[PDB]
mmCIF file of C-alpha atoms and ligand atoms in Angstrom:
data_model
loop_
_atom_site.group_PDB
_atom_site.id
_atom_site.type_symbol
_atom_site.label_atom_id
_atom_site.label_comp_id
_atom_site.label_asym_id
_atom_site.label_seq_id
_atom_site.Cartn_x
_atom_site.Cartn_y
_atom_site.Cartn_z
ATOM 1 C CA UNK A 1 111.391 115.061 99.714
ATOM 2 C CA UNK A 2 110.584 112.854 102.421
ATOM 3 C CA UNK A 3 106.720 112.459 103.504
ATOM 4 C CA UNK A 4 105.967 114.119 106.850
ATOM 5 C CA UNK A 5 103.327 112.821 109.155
ATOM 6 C CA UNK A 6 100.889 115.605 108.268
ATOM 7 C CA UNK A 7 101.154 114.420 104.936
ATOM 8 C CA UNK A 8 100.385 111.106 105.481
ATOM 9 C CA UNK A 9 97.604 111.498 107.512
ATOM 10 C CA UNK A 10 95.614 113.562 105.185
ATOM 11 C CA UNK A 11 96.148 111.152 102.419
ATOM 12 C CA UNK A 12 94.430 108.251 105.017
ATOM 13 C CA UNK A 13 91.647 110.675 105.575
ATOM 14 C CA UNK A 14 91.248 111.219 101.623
ATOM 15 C CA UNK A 15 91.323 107.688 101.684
ATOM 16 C CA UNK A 16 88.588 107.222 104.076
ATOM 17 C CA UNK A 17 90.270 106.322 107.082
ATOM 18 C CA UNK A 18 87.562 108.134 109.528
ATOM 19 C CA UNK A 19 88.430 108.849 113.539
ATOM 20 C CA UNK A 20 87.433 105.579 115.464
ATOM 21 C CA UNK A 21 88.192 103.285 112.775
ATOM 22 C CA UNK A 22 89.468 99.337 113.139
ATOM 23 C CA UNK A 23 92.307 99.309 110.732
ATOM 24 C CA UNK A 24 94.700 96.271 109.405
ATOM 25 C CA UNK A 25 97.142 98.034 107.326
ATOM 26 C CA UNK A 26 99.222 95.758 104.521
ATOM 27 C CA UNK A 27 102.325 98.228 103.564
ATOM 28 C CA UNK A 28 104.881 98.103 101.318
ATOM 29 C CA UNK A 29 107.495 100.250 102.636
ATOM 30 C CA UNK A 30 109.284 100.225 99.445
ATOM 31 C CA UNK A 31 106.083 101.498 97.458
ATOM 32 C CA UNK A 32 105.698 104.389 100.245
ATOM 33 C CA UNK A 33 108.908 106.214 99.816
ATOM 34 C CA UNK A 34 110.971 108.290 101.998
ATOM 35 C CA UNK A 35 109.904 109.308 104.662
ATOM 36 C CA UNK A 36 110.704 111.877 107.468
ATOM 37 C CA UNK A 37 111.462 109.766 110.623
ATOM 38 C CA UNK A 38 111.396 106.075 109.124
ATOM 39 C CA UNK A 39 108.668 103.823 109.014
ATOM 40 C CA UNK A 40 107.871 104.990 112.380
ATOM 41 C CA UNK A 41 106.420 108.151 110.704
ATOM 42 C CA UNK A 42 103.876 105.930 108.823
ATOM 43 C CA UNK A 43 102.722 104.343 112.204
ATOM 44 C CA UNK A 44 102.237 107.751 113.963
ATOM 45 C CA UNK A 45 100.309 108.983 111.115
ATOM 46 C CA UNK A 46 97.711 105.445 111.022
ATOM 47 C CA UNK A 47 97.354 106.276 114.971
ATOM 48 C CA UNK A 48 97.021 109.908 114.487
ATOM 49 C CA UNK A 49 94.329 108.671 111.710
ATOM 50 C CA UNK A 50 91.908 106.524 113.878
ATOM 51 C CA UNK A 51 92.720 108.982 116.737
ATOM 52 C CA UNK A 52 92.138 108.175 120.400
ATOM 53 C CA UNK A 53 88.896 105.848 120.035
ATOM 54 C CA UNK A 54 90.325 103.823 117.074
ATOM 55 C CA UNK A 55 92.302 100.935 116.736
ATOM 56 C CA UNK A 56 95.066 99.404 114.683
ATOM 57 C CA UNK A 57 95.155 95.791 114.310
ATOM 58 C CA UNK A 58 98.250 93.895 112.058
ATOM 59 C CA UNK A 59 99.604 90.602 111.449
ATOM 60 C CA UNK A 60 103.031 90.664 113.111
ATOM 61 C CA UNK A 61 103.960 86.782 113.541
ATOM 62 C CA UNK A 62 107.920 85.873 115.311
ATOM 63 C CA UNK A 63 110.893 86.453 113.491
ATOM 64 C CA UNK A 64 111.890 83.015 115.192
ATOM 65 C CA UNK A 65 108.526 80.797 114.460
ATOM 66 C CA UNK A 66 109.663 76.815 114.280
ATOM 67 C CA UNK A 67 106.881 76.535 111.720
ATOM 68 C CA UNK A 68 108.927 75.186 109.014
ATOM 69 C CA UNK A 69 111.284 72.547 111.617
ATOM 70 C CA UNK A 70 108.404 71.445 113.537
ATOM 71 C CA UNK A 71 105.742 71.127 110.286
ATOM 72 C CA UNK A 72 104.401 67.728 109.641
ATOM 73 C CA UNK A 73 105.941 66.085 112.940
ATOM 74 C CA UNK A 74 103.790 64.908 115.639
ATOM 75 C CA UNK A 75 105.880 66.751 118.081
ATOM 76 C CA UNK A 76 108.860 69.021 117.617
ATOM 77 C CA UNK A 77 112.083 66.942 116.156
ATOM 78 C CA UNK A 78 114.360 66.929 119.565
ATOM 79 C CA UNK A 79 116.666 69.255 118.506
ATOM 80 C CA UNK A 80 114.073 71.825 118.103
ATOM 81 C CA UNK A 81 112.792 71.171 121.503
ATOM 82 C CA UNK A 82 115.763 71.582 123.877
ATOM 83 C CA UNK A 83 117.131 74.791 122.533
ATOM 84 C CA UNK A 84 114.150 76.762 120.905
ATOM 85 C CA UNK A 85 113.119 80.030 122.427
ATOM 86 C CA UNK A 86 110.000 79.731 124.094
ATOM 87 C CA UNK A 87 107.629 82.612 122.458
ATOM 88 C CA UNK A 88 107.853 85.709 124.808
ATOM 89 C CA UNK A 89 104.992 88.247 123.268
ATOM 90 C CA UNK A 90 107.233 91.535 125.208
ATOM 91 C CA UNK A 91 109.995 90.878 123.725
ATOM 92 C CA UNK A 92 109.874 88.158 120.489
ATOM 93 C CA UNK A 93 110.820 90.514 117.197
ATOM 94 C CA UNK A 94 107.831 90.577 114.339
ATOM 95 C CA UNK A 95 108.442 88.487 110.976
ATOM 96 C CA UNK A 96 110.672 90.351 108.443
ATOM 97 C CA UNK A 97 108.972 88.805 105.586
ATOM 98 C CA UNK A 98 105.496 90.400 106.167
ATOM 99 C CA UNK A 99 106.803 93.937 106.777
ATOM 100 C CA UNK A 100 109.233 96.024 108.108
ATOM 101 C CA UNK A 101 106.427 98.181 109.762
ATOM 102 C CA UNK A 102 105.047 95.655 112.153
ATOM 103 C CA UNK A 103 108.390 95.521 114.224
ATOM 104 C CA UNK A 104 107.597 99.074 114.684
ATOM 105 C CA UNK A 105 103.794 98.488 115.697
ATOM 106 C CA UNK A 106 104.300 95.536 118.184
ATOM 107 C CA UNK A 107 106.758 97.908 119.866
ATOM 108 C CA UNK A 108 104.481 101.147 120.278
ATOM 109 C CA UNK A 109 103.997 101.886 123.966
ATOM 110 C CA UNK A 110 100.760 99.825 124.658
ATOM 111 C CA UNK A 111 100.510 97.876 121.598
ATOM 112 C CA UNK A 112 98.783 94.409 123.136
ATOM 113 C CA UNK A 113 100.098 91.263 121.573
ATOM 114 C CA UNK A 114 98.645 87.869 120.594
ATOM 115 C CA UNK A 115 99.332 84.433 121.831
ATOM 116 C CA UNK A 116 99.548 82.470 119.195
ATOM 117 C CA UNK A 117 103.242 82.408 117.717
ATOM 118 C CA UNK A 118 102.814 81.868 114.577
ATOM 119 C CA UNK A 119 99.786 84.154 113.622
ATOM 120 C CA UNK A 120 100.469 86.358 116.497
ATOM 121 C CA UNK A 121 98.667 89.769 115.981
ATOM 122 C CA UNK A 122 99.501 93.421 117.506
ATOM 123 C CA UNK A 123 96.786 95.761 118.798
ATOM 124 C CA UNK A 124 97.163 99.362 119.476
ATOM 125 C CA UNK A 125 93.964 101.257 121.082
ATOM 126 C CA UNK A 126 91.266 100.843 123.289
ATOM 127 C CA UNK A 127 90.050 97.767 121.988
ATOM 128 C CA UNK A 128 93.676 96.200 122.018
ATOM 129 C CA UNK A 129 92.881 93.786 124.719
ATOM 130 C CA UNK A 130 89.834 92.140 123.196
ATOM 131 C CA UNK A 131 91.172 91.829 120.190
ATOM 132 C CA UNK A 132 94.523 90.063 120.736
ATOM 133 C CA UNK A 133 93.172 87.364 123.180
ATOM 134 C CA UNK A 134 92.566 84.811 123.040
ATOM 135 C CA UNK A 135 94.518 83.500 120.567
ATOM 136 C CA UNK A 136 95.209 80.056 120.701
ATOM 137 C CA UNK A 137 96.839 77.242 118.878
ATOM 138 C CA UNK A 138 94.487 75.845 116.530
ATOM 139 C CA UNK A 139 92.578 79.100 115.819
ATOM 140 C CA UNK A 140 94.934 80.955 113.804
ATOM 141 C CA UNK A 141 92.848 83.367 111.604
ATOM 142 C CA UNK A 142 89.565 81.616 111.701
ATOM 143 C CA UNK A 143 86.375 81.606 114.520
ATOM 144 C CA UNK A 144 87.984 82.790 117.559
ATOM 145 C CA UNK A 145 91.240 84.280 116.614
ATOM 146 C CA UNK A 146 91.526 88.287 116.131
ATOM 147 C CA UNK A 147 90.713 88.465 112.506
ATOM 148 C CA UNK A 148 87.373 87.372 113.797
ATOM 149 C CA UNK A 149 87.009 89.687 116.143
ATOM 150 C CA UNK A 150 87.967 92.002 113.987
ATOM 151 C CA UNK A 151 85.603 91.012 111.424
ATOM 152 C CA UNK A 152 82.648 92.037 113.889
ATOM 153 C CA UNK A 153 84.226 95.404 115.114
ATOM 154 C CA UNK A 154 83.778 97.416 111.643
ATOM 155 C CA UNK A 155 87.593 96.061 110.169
ATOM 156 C CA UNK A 156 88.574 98.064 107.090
ATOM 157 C CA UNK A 157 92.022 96.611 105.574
ATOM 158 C CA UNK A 158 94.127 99.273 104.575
ATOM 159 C CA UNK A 159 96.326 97.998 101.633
ATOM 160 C CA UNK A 160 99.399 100.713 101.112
ATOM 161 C CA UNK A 161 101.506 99.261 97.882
ATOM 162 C CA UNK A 162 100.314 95.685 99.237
ATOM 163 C CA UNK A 163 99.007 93.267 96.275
ATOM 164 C CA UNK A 164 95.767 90.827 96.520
ATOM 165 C CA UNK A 165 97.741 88.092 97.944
ATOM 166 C CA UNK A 166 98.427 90.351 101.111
ATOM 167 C CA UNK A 167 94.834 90.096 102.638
ATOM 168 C CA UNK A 168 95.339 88.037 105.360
ATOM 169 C CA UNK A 169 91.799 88.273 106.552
ATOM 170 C CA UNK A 170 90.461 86.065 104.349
ATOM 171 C CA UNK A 171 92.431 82.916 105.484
ATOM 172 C CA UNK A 172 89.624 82.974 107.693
ATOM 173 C CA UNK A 173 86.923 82.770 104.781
ATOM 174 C CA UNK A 174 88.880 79.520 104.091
ATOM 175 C CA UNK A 175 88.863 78.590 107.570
ATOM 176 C CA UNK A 176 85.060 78.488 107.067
ATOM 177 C CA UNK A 177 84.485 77.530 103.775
ATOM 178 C CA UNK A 178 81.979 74.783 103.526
ATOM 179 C CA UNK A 179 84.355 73.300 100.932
ATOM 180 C CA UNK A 180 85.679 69.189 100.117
ATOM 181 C CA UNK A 181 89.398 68.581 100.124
ATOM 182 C CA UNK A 182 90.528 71.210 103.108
ATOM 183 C CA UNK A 183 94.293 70.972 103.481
ATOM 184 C CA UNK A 184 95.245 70.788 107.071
ATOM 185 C CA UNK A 185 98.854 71.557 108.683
ATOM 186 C CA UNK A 186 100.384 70.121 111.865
ATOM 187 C CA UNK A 187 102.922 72.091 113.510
ATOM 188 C CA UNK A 188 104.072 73.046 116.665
ATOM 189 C CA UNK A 189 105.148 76.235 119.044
ATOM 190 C CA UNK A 190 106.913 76.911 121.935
ATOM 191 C CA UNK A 191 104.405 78.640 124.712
ATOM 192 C CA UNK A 192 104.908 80.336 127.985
ATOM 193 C CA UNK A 193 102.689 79.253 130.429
ATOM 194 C CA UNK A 194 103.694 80.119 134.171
ATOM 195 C CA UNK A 195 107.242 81.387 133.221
ATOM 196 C CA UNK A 196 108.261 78.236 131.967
ATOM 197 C CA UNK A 197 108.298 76.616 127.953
ATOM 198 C CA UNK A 198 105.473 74.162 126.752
ATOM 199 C CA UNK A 199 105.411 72.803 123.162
ATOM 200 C CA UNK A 200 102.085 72.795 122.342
ATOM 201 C CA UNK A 201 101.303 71.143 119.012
ATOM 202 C CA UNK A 202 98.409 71.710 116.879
ATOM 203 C CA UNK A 203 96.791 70.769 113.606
ATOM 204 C CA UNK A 204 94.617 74.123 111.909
ATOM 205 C CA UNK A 205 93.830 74.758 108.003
ATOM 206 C CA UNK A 206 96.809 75.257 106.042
ATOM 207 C CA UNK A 207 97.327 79.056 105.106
ATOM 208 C CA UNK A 208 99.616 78.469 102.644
ATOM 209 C CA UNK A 209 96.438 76.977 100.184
ATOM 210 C CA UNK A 210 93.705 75.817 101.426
ATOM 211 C CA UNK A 211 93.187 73.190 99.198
ATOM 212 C CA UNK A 212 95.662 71.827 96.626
ATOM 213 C CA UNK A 213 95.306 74.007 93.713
ATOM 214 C CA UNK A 214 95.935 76.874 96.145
ATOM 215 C CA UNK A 215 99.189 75.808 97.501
ATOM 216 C CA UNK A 216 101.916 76.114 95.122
ATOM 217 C CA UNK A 217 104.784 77.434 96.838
ATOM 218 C CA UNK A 218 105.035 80.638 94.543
ATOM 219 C CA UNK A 219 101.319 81.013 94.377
ATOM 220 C CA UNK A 220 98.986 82.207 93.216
ATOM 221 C CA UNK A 221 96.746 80.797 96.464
ATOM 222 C CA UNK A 222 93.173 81.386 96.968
ATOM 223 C CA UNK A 223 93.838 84.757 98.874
ATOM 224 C CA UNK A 224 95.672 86.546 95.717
ATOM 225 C CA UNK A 225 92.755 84.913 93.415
ATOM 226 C CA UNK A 226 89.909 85.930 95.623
ATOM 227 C CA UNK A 227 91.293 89.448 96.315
ATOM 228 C CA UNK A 228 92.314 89.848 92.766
ATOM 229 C CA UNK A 229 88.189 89.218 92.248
ATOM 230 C CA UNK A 230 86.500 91.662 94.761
ATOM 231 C CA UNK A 231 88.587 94.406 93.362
ATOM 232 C CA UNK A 232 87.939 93.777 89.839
ATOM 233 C CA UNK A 233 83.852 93.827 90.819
ATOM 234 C CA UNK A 234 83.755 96.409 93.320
ATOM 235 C CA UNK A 235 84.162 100.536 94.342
ATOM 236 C CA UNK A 236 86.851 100.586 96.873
ATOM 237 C CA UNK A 237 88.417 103.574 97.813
ATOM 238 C CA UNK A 238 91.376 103.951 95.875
ATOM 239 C CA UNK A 239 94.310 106.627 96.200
ATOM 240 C CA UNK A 240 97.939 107.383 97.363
ATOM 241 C CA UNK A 241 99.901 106.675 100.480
ATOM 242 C CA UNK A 242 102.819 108.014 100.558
ATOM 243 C CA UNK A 243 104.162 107.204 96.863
ATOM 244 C CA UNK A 244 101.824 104.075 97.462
ATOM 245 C CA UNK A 245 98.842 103.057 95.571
ATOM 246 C CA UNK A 246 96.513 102.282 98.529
ATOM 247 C CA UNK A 247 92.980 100.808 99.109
ATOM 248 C CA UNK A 248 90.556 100.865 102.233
ATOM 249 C CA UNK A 249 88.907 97.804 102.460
ATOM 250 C CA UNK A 250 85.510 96.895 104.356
ATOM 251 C CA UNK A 251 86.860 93.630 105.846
ATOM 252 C CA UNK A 252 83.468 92.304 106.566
ATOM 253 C CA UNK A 253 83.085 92.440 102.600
ATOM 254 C CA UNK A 254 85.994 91.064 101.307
ATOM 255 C CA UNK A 255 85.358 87.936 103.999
ATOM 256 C CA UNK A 256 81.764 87.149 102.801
ATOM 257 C CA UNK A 257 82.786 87.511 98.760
ATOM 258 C CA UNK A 258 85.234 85.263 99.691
ATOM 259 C CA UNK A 259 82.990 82.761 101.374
ATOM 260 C CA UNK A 260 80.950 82.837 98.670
ATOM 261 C CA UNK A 261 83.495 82.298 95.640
ATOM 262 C CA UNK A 262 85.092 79.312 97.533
ATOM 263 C CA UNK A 263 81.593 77.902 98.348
ATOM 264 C CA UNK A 264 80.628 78.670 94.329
ATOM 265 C CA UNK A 265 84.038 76.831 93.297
ATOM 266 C CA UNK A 266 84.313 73.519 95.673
ATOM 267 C CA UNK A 267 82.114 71.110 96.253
ATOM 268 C CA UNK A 268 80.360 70.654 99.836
HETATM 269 N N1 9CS B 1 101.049 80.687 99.849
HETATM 270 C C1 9CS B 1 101.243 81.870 99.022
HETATM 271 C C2 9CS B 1 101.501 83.055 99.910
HETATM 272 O O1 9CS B 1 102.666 82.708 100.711
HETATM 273 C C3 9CS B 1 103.045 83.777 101.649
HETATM 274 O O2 9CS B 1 101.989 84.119 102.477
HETATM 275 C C4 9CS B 1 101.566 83.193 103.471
HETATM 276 C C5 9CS B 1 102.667 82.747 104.455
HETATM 277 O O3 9CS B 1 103.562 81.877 103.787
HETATM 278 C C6 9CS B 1 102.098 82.011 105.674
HETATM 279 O O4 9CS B 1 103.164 81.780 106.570
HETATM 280 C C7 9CS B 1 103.273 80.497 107.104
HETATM 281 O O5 9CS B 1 104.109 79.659 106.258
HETATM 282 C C8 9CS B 1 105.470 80.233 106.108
HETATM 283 C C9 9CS B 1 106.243 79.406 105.144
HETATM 284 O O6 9CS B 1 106.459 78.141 105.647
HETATM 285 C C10 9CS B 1 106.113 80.361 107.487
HETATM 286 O O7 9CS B 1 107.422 80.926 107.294
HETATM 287 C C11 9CS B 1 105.287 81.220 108.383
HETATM 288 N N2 9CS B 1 105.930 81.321 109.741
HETATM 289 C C12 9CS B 1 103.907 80.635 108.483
HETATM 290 O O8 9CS B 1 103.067 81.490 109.224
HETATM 291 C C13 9CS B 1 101.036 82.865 106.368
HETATM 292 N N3 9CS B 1 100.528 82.179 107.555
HETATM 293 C C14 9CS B 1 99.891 83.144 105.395
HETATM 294 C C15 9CS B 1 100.415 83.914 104.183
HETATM 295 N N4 9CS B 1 99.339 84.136 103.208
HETATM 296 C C16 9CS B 1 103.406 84.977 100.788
HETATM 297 N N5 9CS B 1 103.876 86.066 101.708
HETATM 298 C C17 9CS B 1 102.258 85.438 99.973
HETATM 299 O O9 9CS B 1 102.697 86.586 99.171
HETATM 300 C C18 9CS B 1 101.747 84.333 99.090
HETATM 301 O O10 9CS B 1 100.514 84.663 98.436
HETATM 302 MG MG1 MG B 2 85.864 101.751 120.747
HETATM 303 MG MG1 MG B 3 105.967 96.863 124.359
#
């Protein structure tokens, strides 16, 4: 039978999920199960969980990010640039591949969203505005971006069916890992900025490994190996979601282990 929203939101206060909370869910839909009205049932139950004075924070990105035709040029390839979509944060659809929730978040009424095309973030609650801006190109998930401000505000990472390699706070552990051999990406997005398109293009730390024993295509990256760490070493909450095995996560936690094991691994 279907999970209701009642349901749900029990299991996220059995979890720990406590009213005012700054969450960054990681779902699985698929790992959840049924449920009563769609994956919109799931969001109304993580807002009915933080309640009025907490916030929801999630990775949403573009369905239509150039990142893979514009990556490694110095400026988009021409054909890119006279017919892409400039990124329009009311209306640009979330990435498929990350979720089928967050399509459902960034629409909420009042969900805020983030600048930055490619790691654009959603925001629902009254924080929303601080966290989402600014966002700019070249600060994707490291200082200055919302993970960071998240980070500071008492983030727990909520992990429904989601495995290590789905914690994308710490991309910004790498961001600031005092490590040798960073792996840097260039890329570039098409911006509003008075109503009309700029490419802007950037360079920032490669998320997809942050240095070269990380980055194999099918993984595992330093993320998954990291993650796959701090759980084996330390109590997290731990219980279901839905049909989902789930985990609340102090964010602020993960973030420094993960500072730490790069920093212990790589040379300065
Ligand atoms: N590397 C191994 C990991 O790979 C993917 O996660 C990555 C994404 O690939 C990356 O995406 C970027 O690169 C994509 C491919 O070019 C673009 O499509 C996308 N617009 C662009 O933002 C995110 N920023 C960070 C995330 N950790 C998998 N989901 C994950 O399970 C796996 O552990
Ligand atoms: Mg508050
Ligand atoms: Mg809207």
């Amino acid at each position: 039978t279907p999970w209701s929203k009642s349901e749900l939101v029990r299991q996220l206060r059995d979890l720990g999920v406590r009213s005012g909370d700054m969450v960054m869910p990681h779902v699985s839909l698929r790992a959840v199960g049924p449920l009563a009205d769609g994956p919109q049932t799931l969001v109304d139950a993580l807002i009915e969980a933080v309640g009025p004075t907490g916030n929801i924070l999630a990775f949403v990105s573009w369905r239509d990010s150039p990142y893979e035709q514009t990556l490694g040029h110095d400026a988009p390839p021409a054909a890119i640039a006279q017919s892409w979509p400039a990124f329009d944060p009311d209306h640009a659809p979330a990435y498929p591949g990350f979720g089928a929730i967050n399509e459902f978040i960034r629409t909420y009424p009042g969900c805020r969203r983030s600048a930055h095309p490619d790691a654009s973030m959603a925001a629902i609650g009254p924080d929303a505005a601080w966290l989402v801006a600014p966002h700019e190109m070249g600060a994707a998930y490291g200082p200055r971006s919302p993970i960071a401000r998240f980070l500071a505000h008492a983030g727990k990472i909520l992990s429904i069916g989601a495995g290590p390699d789905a914690v994308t706070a710490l991309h910004y552990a790498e961001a600031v890992a005092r490590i040798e051999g960073k792996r840097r990406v260039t890329y570039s997005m098409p911006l509003l900025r008075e109503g009309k398109r700029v490419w802007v293009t950037t360079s920032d730390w490669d998320s997809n490994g942050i240095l070269d024993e990380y980055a194999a295509p099918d993984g595992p990256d330093a993320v998954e190996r990291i993650a796959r760490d701090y759980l084996a070493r330390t109590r997290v909450a731990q219980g279901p979601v839905g049909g989902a095995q789930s985990r609340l996560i102090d964010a602020a936690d993960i973030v420094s282990f993960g500072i730490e094991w790069l920093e212990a691994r790589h040379a300065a």
